[PDB]
Design a protein around this ligand. Structure first.
Ligand SMILES: C#Cc1nc2c(N)ncnc2n1CC
Ligand SMILES: C#Cc1nc2c(N)ncnc2n1CC
Ligand SMILES: C#Cc1nc2c(N)ncnc2n1CC
Ligand SMILES: C#Cc1nc2c(N)ncnc2n1CC
Lengths: 261, 261, 261, 261
């Protein structure tokens, strides 16, 4: 089909990209970075995240694949030595596809901006104290005071979510997970503390109490938003599709990354 | 229909039970604690757990309801003043039912014992050091050294799971959560640390490394098992059914219990 | 003696300041905000922190006292109704003084800036990834990757240190405590995780690995420092002196603030 | 002087013991396991703990030394290849000694038992729910509900204390640290959560609320105590003395054990 390859930019990943293109030249494949059906990422998980966001409006027409030239990644989970075998099997096609859930972030102002996250979306203040009211399906759940909040996808749970104490969720679970950053808890101010895992169709709404300016991240992207009335989280209707060419279980990927490999 | 009522035993809960029975006597209801279709628990969540385990072989033919005479419970979530209104609506029937997932524990010896948990199942040693190999879907994930492990249901996540750092999961998610108790982590011994959330059909197997005697809890029940070859966790095929007579969202129940009420 | 009074600025604290000044006018007291020997703070702990930093070059010649017009503070630990009794006992003098340790932060460039902290000093990146090498008494201890680090005084342990998982230390202990913010731990990157408590004369040095720009906070003050070669932490030789006019134990102050009052 | 050597019992440690004894036979040394002045432990930290407790009534007349035949220990911190050099320098004497603080546990009944701990002392229930009132210097601080409590020495902070979230304290600090095991925190029951670090002369008292039977551990020893009225913790007046024959900083020992070696 049509395909394209993004590279981290170092000479290891560029030279690997050129060899795969040359290998693809021996099959019924067309290089097209406008409307590809296969997107190959060569580098690390950061390279994969840029590839995902480069094409986030054609997600249902694309199967992603990642090659790690550095350490093993959770998205770039195939080694460079497998590139030739990867070229042949992608060209023959007829592979199976797997889908991971995504997170939808809505930012409203007094003007509504929506973002798609593969890992997580975080909210911090623009300098002063961070205070928001946390609303779950229209019921006021808590007044959070602290550094910030993080809403993670299942496959994002091994990233910033993990460093904040969140649970690791198998990506077949259509859910999102909210974790706290350095919350203040005393006799006056009370947060839940524990991570919270929300199913599909649950809406988590953040509403300002005083300051209306927040630094909002979506994966790598981080923008200062001004005059926001609401931050809105829910599991996206859209999913990311991975080209699957062998068995590499998520829990094995967790073992290889954090226990030993 | 047929119904029965269990009481914590104090005079507040016994006298409330007698008044509901007398109130039920004005309707087409039959008291039967052998084959009831409605099980009413009056006391706390512990009273509810005993009622659940008393009838865990007729789970698909029973709708449970709980009344808290002490503080608000996550299962006994209706107040005693609502008993009269509860009697009338149960008698008329035509209520909606909600279902929560359950945890299945299998203990094998050298002789296989299965248990159903509404909250969680924990494993500790019988005295000496607790060491098990943790196997996820037949792949060896980690060698756990510490005090013990805890596998929780979604509705159990607000109980022992919460005290161990686990996430709170909405009970509509068919999953189970594994949390660590005081794990040893150094250069030699490595555990994942983070809680792990497993979907249906994932099997988590604990296998002894040296000692074969473990103290295993299932909700309130705690038995010392000897000569065990494997402890096996998975989401049960069976579910507990609750009689639903108004809207009391899980996240509101979490708010009322941990934030303020 | 000479004395001065700072107020949070609201009319509750200003009117309380004027009444204490008028009450002081009936004794051998002189209002002097240039070289006072008694510094009275009326407001909250933030008002007290500004008073401490306003006079941090005359620390050995000043006894501080704090009045909380809002909720109970750890430094402003006397209620407004005690102001009249406070005026009379300060004027008579002959009170006992208590001393708390302080934290010394040294920032070197390629140009060396020293700061005194009553609560804590934190280090974060100026945007990108935060990576520093952590050196303890000239031995390289770890390479920290994460959001940032926090070094707390004993009396600061109930503030940001507590929200990060740090221990609460009784202020009679001459020490400082280092806590991590959202550290990354996998097979490649390893931090200690646990808070670290250092005695006097131990020097904790942070050294950049790549980026040389850091956002450094000292209590409330937060400055972006550029071209820094080293951040240096140690227990200060200087201490803050409190005028003590009755028994209010630190652990009781902890109980009143976090358990119930 | 007089000396003795304890061995873990495996043939590696026994054969090393015999060679050191033979090496000691070439100097003015006497083997005496009744009144030694040097106690050599060959094995692991567990072997060292037994040696410490074997002679805990002659602590001020003994300098301890530990040899690790397995992995590096925090007390057995010298390798077997250094045994010959260790023999020669102990025989010549004139070494420097270092001292670590110890923890004193007092158990009173309705009959008072005192124990000395090098690592920590823990308290759990004998089966049912664990509830104690926590009293600090005669002020009631909290009502703890959970699995148990752990009071650690400074050098014990790298052991069970670390697994419970406690801070690592440099052993030159005369203090003790209290950490919680799986505490219950909701609207009704409140604990401090954070570890607590207490200086010398602070007394931490545990008092039963209902059940009077507790499983109390002191390092390796674990005894079920019945009819206890109070558990009493404070920094001991006694200290353990180590023979110091080169520089091996505590923080380097922490680095080698948890970061990499
Ligand atoms: C970029 C990126 C990224 N995504 C991750 C993930 N989903 N799990 C673990 N590590 C991850 N990284 C690297 C920091
Ligand atoms: C028995 C019981 C019980 N079940 C609970 C639950 N699911 N969530 C929160 N608290 C709970 N309890 C009381 C200790
Ligand atoms: C400003 C300030 C301040 N200092 C504190 C402290 N030492 N302990 C607890 N809370 C504290 N605050 C309020 C956020
Ligand atoms: C026995 C023993 C022992 N004491 C220790 C200590 N003080 N720090 C770290 N590990 C330790 N161990 C081994 C479990």
């Amino acid at each position: 089909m049509k395909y394209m390859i993004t590279s981290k930019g170092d000479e290891k990943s560029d030279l690997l990209r050129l060899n795969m293109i040359a290998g693809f030249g021996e099959y019924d494949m067309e290089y097209d970075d406008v409307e590809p059906e296969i997107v190959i990422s060569i580098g690390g998980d950061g390279t994969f995240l840029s590839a995902f966001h480069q094409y986030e409006e054609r997600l249902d027409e694309i199967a992603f694949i990642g090659i790690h030239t550095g350490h093993l990644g959770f998205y770039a989970d195939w080694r460079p030595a497998e590139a030739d075998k990867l070229v042949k099997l992608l060209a023959k096609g007829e592979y199976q596809k797997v889908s991971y859930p995504l997170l939808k972030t809505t930012v409203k102002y007094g003007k509504e901006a929506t973002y798609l996250a593969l890992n997580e979306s975080t909210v911090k203040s623009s300098g002063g104290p961070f205070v928001v009211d946390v609303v779950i399906n229209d019921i006021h759940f808590e007044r959070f005071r602290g550094d910030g909040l993080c809403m993670s996808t299942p496959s994002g749970t091994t990233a910033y979510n993990k460093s904040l104490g969140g649970a690791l969720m198998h990506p077949s679970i259509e859910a999102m997970q909210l974790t706290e950053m350095a919350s203040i808890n005393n006799r006056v101010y009370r947060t839940i503390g524990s991570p919270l895992v929300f199913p599909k169709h649950h809406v988590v709404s953040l509403q300002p109490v005083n300051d209306k300016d927040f630094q909002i991240s979506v994966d790598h992207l981080s923008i200062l938003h001004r005059d926001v009335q609401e931050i809105r989280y829910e599991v996206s209707a859209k999913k990311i599709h991975f080209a699957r060419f062998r068995s590499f279980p998520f829990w094995r990927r967790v073992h290889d990354s954090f226990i030993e490999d």
